[PDB]
Enzyme design. Structure first.
Site, PDB file in Angstrom:
ATOM      1  N   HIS A  41      40.834  43.712  38.418  1.00 32.03           N
ATOM      2  CA  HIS A  41      41.024  43.657  36.969  1.00 32.03           C
ATOM      3  C   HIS A  41      39.743  43.246  36.239  1.00 32.03           C
ATOM      4  O   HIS A  41      39.767  43.073  35.025  1.00 32.03           O
ATOM      5  CB  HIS A  41      42.216  42.763  36.599  1.00 32.03           C
ATOM      6  N   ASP A  85      43.927  43.070  44.973  1.00 27.81           N
ATOM      7  CA  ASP A  85      43.108  42.830  43.794  1.00 27.81           C
ATOM      8  C   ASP A  85      41.623  42.894  44.156  1.00 27.81           C
ATOM      9  O   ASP A  85      40.876  41.935  43.891  1.00 27.81           O
ATOM     10  CB  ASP A  85      43.472  41.487  43.166  1.00 27.81           C
ATOM     11  N   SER A 174      35.918  34.894  38.768  1.00 28.07           N
ATOM     12  CA  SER A 174      36.671  36.070  39.207  1.00 28.07           C
ATOM     13  C   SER A 174      35.785  37.105  39.875  1.00 28.07           C
ATOM     14  O   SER A 174      34.774  37.482  39.304  1.00 28.07           O
ATOM     15  CB  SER A 174      37.311  36.795  38.035  1.00 28.07           C
TER      16      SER A 174
HETATM   17  N1  LIG Z   1      41.785  31.555  33.292  1.00 32.12           N
HETATM   18  C1  LIG Z   1      41.552  32.103  33.913  1.00 32.12           C
HETATM   19  C2  LIG Z   1      41.199  32.976  34.785  1.00 32.12           C
HETATM   20  C3  LIG Z   1      41.054  32.609  36.108  1.00 32.12           C
HETATM   21  C4  LIG Z   1      40.672  33.585  37.022  1.00 32.12           C
HETATM   22  C5  LIG Z   1      40.440  34.892  36.607  1.00 32.12           C
HETATM   23  C6  LIG Z   1      40.573  35.258  35.279  1.00 32.12           C
HETATM   24  C7  LIG Z   1      40.346  36.545  34.860  1.00 32.12           C
HETATM   25  C8  LIG Z   1      38.874  36.643  34.326  1.00 32.12           C
HETATM   26  O1  LIG Z   1      38.105  35.670  34.351  1.00 32.12           O
HETATM   27  N2  LIG Z   1      38.494  37.884  33.931  1.00 32.12           N
HETATM   28  C9  LIG Z   1      39.364  39.118  33.890  1.00 32.12           C
HETATM   29  C10 LIG Z   1      38.288  40.163  34.030  1.00 32.12           C
HETATM   30  C11 LIG Z   1      37.302  39.737  32.970  1.00 32.12           C
HETATM   31  C12 LIG Z   1      37.137  38.280  33.422  1.00 32.12           C
HETATM   32  C13 LIG Z   1      36.730  37.418  32.369  1.00 32.12           C
HETATM   33  O2  LIG Z   1      37.550  37.138  31.495  1.00 32.12           O
HETATM   34  N3  LIG Z   1      35.443  36.915  32.462  1.00 32.12           N
HETATM   35  C14 LIG Z   1      34.970  36.010  31.585  1.00 32.12           C
HETATM   36  C15 LIG Z   1      35.420  35.853  30.256  1.00 32.12           C
HETATM   37  C16 LIG Z   1      34.861  34.843  29.432  1.00 32.12           C
HETATM   38  C17 LIG Z   1      33.849  34.024  29.929  1.00 32.12           C
HETATM   39  C18 LIG Z   1      33.418  34.219  31.250  1.00 32.12           C
HETATM   40 BR1  LIG Z   1      31.997  33.104  31.964  1.00 32.12          BR
HETATM   41  N4  LIG Z   1      33.990  35.191  32.022  1.00 32.12           N
HETATM   42  C19 LIG Z   1      40.970  34.287  34.354  1.00 32.12           C
END
Ligand SMILES: N#Cc1cccc(CC(=O)N2CCC[C@H]2C(=O)Nc2cccc(Br)n2)c1
Length: 221
Positions: A41, A85, A174
């Site tokens: 994802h 995943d 992630s």
């Molecule tokens: N909460 C929470 C969470 C824990 C594990 C995974 C995710 C999902 C995630 O982090 N994603 C989904 C794909 C895009 C990514 C994301 O949102 N990255 C992201 C977004 C904002 C700041 C930072 Br640093 N990284 C969210």
């Protein structure tokens, strides 16, 4: 990364930043010269990958960004699950390897890590519950839990869990690595979840569980 410390510059050379429009989105792991393993994802549009990095912003001799030719999500993955995943990204060209940029070996042997083993999780994920984005790579050492504890708290053979006592992986880590004795054992999952809470352990896809899929995609290098 919560409850961690600054990583030493370039000391984890497999670490990748999966990016959309120049923004860090996901962790990833260089697993071959032209393929990065991440979560399914992360992808979900013009996707790019940054290697060789400690700071996301600052000039460093080893930093380099790449384009993506091809995204291959596991064909049984669904938007609404964290089953299957995984995501293989074929870089637009082979990466330039060196001390600051190289693949990490991944676990082909379908066997569980010894409970209590401290493994290393790294990422540019948030470093607090207010969602602060670090410029520089952080890491944290975390103990692995036994499969039964992993099934009870949370709820399969295809996932593993680690202790999260205010030390945890979080959002943006992630697709990133759980590394144990120098080998990739887990890929941080990519569905949302609570971070830093003992009772709700971090969840990682067991790379060993998908040995056949990963080979079959990379079976064309
Ligand atoms: N909460 C929470 C969470 C824990 C594990 C995974 C995710 C999902 C995630 O982090 N994603 C989904 C794909 C895009 C990514 C994301 O949102 N990255 C992201 C977004 C904002 C700041 C930072 Br640093 N990284 C969210």
């Amino acid at each position: 990364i919560l409850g961690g410390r600054e990583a030493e510059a370039h000391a984890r050379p497999y670490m990748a930043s999966v990016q959309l429009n120049g923004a860090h989105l996901c962790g990833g792991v260089l697993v071959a010269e032209q393929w990065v393993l991440s979560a399914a994802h992360c992808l979900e549009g013009k996707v790019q990958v940054l290697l060789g990095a400690h700071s996301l912003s600052q000039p460093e001799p080893s930093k380099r960004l790449y384009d993506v030719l091809r995204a291959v999500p596991h064909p049984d993955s669904q938007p609404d699950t964290i089953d299957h995943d995984l995501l293989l990204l074929q870089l637009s060209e082979k990466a330039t390897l060196g001390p600051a940029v190289r693949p990490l070996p991944w676990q082909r042997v379908d066997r569980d890590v010894a409970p209590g083993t401290l493994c290393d999780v790294a990422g540019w994920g948030i470093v607090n519950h207010a969602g602060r984005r670090p410029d520089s790579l952080q890491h944290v050492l975390l103990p692995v839990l036994d499969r039964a504890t992993c099934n009870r708290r949370t709820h399969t053979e295809r996932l593993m869990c680690a202790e999260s006592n205010r030390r945890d992986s979080c959002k943006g880590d992630s697709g990133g690595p759980l590394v144990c004795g120098g080998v990739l054992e887990g890929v941080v999952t990519s569905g949302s979840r609570v971070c830093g809470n003992r009772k709700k352990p971090g969840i990682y896809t067991r790379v060993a569980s998908y040995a056949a899929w990963i080979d079959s995609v990379l079976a064309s290098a």
